[PDB]
Amino acid sequence: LPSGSDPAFSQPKSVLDAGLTCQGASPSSVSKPILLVPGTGTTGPQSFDSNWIPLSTQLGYTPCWISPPPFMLNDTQVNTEYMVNAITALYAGSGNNKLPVLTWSQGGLVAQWGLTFFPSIRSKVDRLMAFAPDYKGTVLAGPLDALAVSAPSVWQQTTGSALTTALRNAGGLTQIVPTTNLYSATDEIVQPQVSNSPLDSSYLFNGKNVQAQAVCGPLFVIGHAGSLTSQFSYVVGRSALRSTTGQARSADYGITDCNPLPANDLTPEQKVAAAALMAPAAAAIVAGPKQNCEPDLMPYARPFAVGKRTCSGIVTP
Template identity: 35%
Template sequence: MRRVTLTLLLPLVTALVAALGTWPAAHADDDGGGGAYAPLDRPGPALSVPRPALAASLACHGDPRTGPAPILLNPATSVTPVENYSWNWANVFAAQGRYYCLVTVPQHTFGDIQVAAEYVVNAIRTMHARTGRRIAVLGHSQGGMNPRWALRFWPDVRPMVAEMIGMAPSNHGTRSIPGCLRGLTTCVPAVWQQLAGSAFIKALNSGAETFAGIDYTNVYTMLDEVVTPPASSGLSTGGGRIANVRVQDVCPLDPYEHVLTGTISPTTYAIVMDALDHDGPAVAARVDRSACRRLSMPGLDPLDARAYVPVLFALPRLVSTMLPLVSLGGAPLLRAEPPLRCYVLAAGC
């Protein structure tokens, strides 16, 4: 019965797939040494987003001083954290007695990712101050990538983060949105910025992709039709401890693609929990193989139709992500990507 139910849901999810992220590409995205960009240790700029907006963006649950390591849930392109996580991961962390927070980015994460990163910076600082502990960051698709912008250009937050975990993260851009043609069509800012070879992607990966003291786990699936090639979710440079884990190396028959990898997949769940439960990033050989016998992650009943209400509510925005000339999340339509902020460049502001 469970298998039949999921089979009926897959056509719907496939319609959503192209939207939660937009990212394939290569790893050589920087200028060779990052020389065109800010030094890795240059202090970050003051946040431009007003403090009341930053404060209102963070919703936290649980006791900040007790339980397992605190975790920040960061949403994918086009969705709110409620739509992305309230029906799955939030249930898991609540059951664990873990303090967790969800950060809501304006314009349904369609806007300038440089602005979205300021919300992540504030969330990390706030959670660290409240808990007195280093936190973990868990993100799906763009949500697994944009915290790296915060870590790259605000060095003060690096000691506050213990784990950076991306589920099908868009770390190296995409070639899967042919409708966004510079000067010819219009697209929302976050889509422009996630095209392969964009100025944003080059700056993001400049100098170093990871930083010492932080463990990076990047989960990806060979069935990902949004992040292609799927292994482009991985990271390779810098001083952080890195694990790029293919779900098929844990469960060879894992059937889930981009959207389900970050929302339902029991294999992804097992990999994420391995990273959270051990020192260092996830280790594929150590991951609990009992996940391979499940159809969905704990915290989610695939037979409960109510679980899918947040996803259905987000459907129009999810589909619109792949379309030029359309903006359903309130973000402006632009003919090219937003310019890099002055703090990104070697010359500074």
Template identity: 35%
Template sequence: MNERRLPIHKLIRSTVVAATTAVALAFAPVTAAFADQGPLYAPVDQPGPALSVPQNLLGASLECSANVSGASRDVVLLIPGTTLTPETNFDGNWFQALDKLNWPYCSVTLPENAMNDIQVSAEYIVNAIRQVNAASGRKVDLLGFSQGGLAPRFALRFWPDTRAMVDDYVALGATNHGSLTVDGMCAAGCAPALQQQRLNSAFTQATNSYQETFAGISYTDIYSHTDQFVTPNLNDSGTTSMHGGGGSITNVALQDVCPLNAADHLATGTYDPVAYALAIDALSHDGPADPDRVPASTCTKLFMPGVDPMTFPGKYVDLWNNVLAQLVAYPHVGTEPALKPYVYAQP
């Protein structure tokens, strides 16, 4: 383990951990405005349920840099994509880049390489937000790749207490409304988490129900026109982009900044310098990213900071092999997991 990344229980007392897993204060009742909007999803202010995953598993999933306790700036929480862990997704790029900036950060390992029910993965993210906020005394900046952009939005949607703990949401190639490509991948069955990332799946419809963003959070959705896995993403009405709600939003393609950029899905979430520049801009300023602040020189770079050009080729081949092996080997199912009862309005 990198000495800068420590189990969270080393950073906060057990009494604080227990307190932060409790459901927050009650919220206002459902309004009549929701009555004619299709399925009776939970109103956006319905308190979230107690977490069903045992606390020892939740705690073990979270690792943080040593400077999280008493942090001088908001803490970045890194959330990996489908088939990935924090190490396969962020070691060799984001971990090293944030170390160089001396920014505090944490990462959360989602169960079974983020291949099973995203509703369960969301509980790990809820716990991570609460614990990091308690340990640092600061708000949390969410930075997720692919499913790592979608899953925290489900957490924010159905555990409203977490919203006040989050400042920035930054997504890299997120499947916010699912993906048409995944529909094809799942035609003969696929992993549960992939079923949930089909275009406009029941899971994504629930995630986006009533409003897609929340006041007090700045949203930056970064995507690529040449993403082969997250489609369609040809403009800001594509699957990654978000619209409506209470947050401030920037939906931006890599090609909006550098027209000749050809990053695919995995590149967007691991080494692309334009994606990095946009994400860092969002995390360095109030509000979401402003593409006009990204230097033109970014377009001439091959890699984001933290990437070692000498070891990159071998590591990238290993990364692709890992992704493909997970997609093939993980048990396939024919339908997505049923939505949990708390997704719906409670009597």
């Protein structure tokens, strides 16, 4: 696992700061912040307005989020710079108190990438609550060879990618801070997720790995977005946030919580918006960046994926 000083940011501080917003507060002075990291093809508000923004507010947090441009489609390594910068700012702005990080989709990959390669934030994050994280990427678009022109982060989230290779070899498939991963065997975006074991893309060693169907049975169906928004997901997430251990507790959730519909506490309007969470991604991609190669790894990540192919060529020693 990488140690010592943080790698330098490729983006200017002003650019990174511009990507961070808190509800009714500035990052420099915020009470009980929670950092929300969005999914591929979305901004922070698009990922969370219908769900964790109001839900974390009702639990006593000030929700904050990053919106790396354009819509999380750029290089995941750059998206991570936004998160690392945000944690540094929010830790300082809350009186040097650790804060929780809650994520959806790529957001979890970003969080774990940050924790793997930027040691400074390990003492600033008290827990990670990741919904449908794709630490191994996904196999559903097929192999990297044969991918059509795609967004930078879509390359990186393809199973076999240089990015996912580097994360694994650097020790990033083991939890770094107390982590809960809530995911679904019926995820239509991220696979494989079916085994309820370390094979699953959402699994971290030593983490609290909660495949919904392991608790709820074979008839429980939630998709990629439902993994974030469901009532079951809320109970698990609430457990993780409140836990003195930093992970969700089995005593806090069971079969009686196996409601696949959006969280009960959301307004009817919020439930509808939550159900339609995937919608904005479609427009985002069409107008979004596309290329025929995976972005180069940053120098800090290269020793963990020698021999993998990126835009400049094969990663050399």
